[PDB]
Amino acid sequence: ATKFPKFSQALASDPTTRRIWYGIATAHDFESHDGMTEENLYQKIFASHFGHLAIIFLWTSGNLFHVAWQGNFEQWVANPLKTKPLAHAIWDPHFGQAALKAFTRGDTVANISYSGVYHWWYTIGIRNNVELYTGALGLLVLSAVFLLAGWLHIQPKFKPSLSWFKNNESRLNHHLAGLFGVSSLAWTGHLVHVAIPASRGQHVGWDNFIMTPPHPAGLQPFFTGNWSVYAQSPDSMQHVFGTSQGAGTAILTFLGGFHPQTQSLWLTDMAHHHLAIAVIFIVAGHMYRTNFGIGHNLKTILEAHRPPSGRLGKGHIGIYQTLTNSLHFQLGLALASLSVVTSLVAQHMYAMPPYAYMAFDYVTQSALYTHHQYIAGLLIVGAFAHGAIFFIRDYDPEQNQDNVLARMLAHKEAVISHLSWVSLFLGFHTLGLYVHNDVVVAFGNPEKQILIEPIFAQWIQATSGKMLYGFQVLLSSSTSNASVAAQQLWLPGWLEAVNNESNSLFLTIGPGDFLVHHAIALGLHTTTLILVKGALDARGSKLMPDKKDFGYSFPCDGPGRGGTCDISAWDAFYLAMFWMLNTIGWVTFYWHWKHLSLWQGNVAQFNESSTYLMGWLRDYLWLNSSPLINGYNPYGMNSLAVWSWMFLFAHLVWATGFMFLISWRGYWQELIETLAWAHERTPLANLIRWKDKPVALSIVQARLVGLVHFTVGYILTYAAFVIASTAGKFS
């Protein structure tokens, strides 16, 4: 309050430069401030949520504004296969002359928007720049609304009471109904009123959306339940997305499968889809009691699930108490569920490409998947990091008297021993088989390889109709129960998309699928060995049982008792962030090298040269970095010269991380003394004396900043290589 950390007086008394860094990194740590109690905490995170949401909508209004103003959006609408989607323009004063010829696309010098945004705005039904301006203003207004609320609920009499925050009971009555159920219903109110007619040629802007019904007859003879009229005449075959030719007029037809032409999902399928998800979520909103009293008390829902089998402790009696009073448990479930949702998003954006003329630009599809996978891994590691924060700064094993959680801390030894077992097994049985296949391929003999057919994935693709394997089971067999059971409904529009080898749906599978998917499960089980380790040994280990007393990110225990480098629950974060970047590494190298074989066409280039490691370092890193690393030559440059620069730049980020990760503090803490000796002793600079005393970075910060350069270097290197690689082999 006096100086800097206007929030912690334990850091304002510090004369060093640690008051700055810990003043920054403990700013959002609202549970550890001067005198901020519970009401003063929820009444601050609730306002900062609004500030956050307004930052999100300021950002999306940013994309709407630059696409509205510097992009080539409607020219892209004219030819979505040919013209590249432009991002915002450039103003460098550093582009001398030869750079500008490598960026001119029309009058603009803009970047090429490799983020899939024109596809989604083209399936929404935005066919102009004018709607992008009205939308951008429509989100500047919304960000002003959210900043108004966060400023407004920190105004004192509008700061809501904590009993309102502990209406945990009824947020689920309103999120599942209002946020999820209504809005998705409202999103059908977009798709029925905008995306279906502006895909079927009818420009239904903001004028005739009440005078032109999306079905030619609607809602006066349609409370009678004659709902097959809304799925009467589908858009069958002979249609191009955007015009009115070859298209019917039904709204909610569930054909299943793709377009024949744009290789995306039907918008009738999405209108019916979000409509059904909307109805089911609105039904799920009627789940819990309120002031009315028709629902479920959550205490009666966790208290009742104590098994009389008796194996599962004294049941969940104690769990509802440690979700209301806790937050890091609730944030751990939030990041867990959001993270599995992101990985589901990533595993479906390529597999079932939703957006017209995606899977035709092979860079934006390659960036959306990798984007949501690295964000997926970040949010899992957040779920376990706040898991360990829950077990340290939030866990009460007296309200959790022999609870399910206390049972978890009881058998955490068996948990960590068996995670370490499966991780060891997969690490001797991916690396064993890749070094086997790589030695054997190296010794003039690709035949003596171990290739195991991944028959379980091939059988599961046979359960979804991929007839290219010869199992002839539930959907691959055309005479079975499920094959007849949806023979009219959605099968023949969908098995065409399955049995095709053009689309990225249910890919053809060699033993690279086997060896890589074991490598992925190695990554998941190592990363949960670490995270579940320093989330269950977050509280106390047999090295030091004092760990719960020191908080989350305490540095160490000194050299005592053998040495104690990185014992904290923050280490599990600190190490499983490397395993996060690694595991999402192998996921996206595998995906990206699978689709550089599909999109090129030579699937045999993958399946012959991916079962061993020089297949990866040869056929994928050495070959596909060739149009990258030719980004600028001593003969000139091209448009990839940004990424080939960034690539190199990112290596310089990555290895600077090692300077903090490898080489720890007491080197630098006795080197800053040489620098401060030399600054104090010299003339003409001893006048300019510091105020904060120069001190080397503390060993939680140092491992953290080395981790941050490891992430930024890693992710910028691979975002350089995805985009420069696919943008070099194509576009």
Partner: protein
Amino acid sequence: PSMPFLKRPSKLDGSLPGGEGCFDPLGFTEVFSLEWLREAEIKHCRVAMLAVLGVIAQEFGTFDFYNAKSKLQLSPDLHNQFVQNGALQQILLFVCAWEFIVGLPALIESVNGNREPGYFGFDPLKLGGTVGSAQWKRMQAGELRNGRLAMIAFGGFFHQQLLTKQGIIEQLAHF
């Protein structure tokens, strides 16, 4: 009770300008602190009086140069003849000034309880603009009641569409 109704004697109100009584049958003034609801009531009644005089005064047939109305609802012709002129954007935007600039701290005066939550000053009248006891309350009841009848009467002025599809003057030419 204090209410001229079934029963709820002075739940939280009773001195507010209900000249016929305090109505309040449902538990809003139980827990809503009543100053918020009073600012919302008065702001809704002002904007609804503007709405109903808008509908009637437009149904006396006046345009600078536009289409025939046939309605003052049903968005494309009326509303998106106006929006495609680039014209309603500012008539929203100045109210986007008015509420955020002189309505939001006005609402902060409706936070602390130091406002009498109508009161944007604004009496440009001589001989009848009494800020004191009698004419302020008995005229504020006039704004209140004419605003409430503006709310419902604007409700009917909207909802005469299904069996009508015409003007409300044409509704007066029908039974």
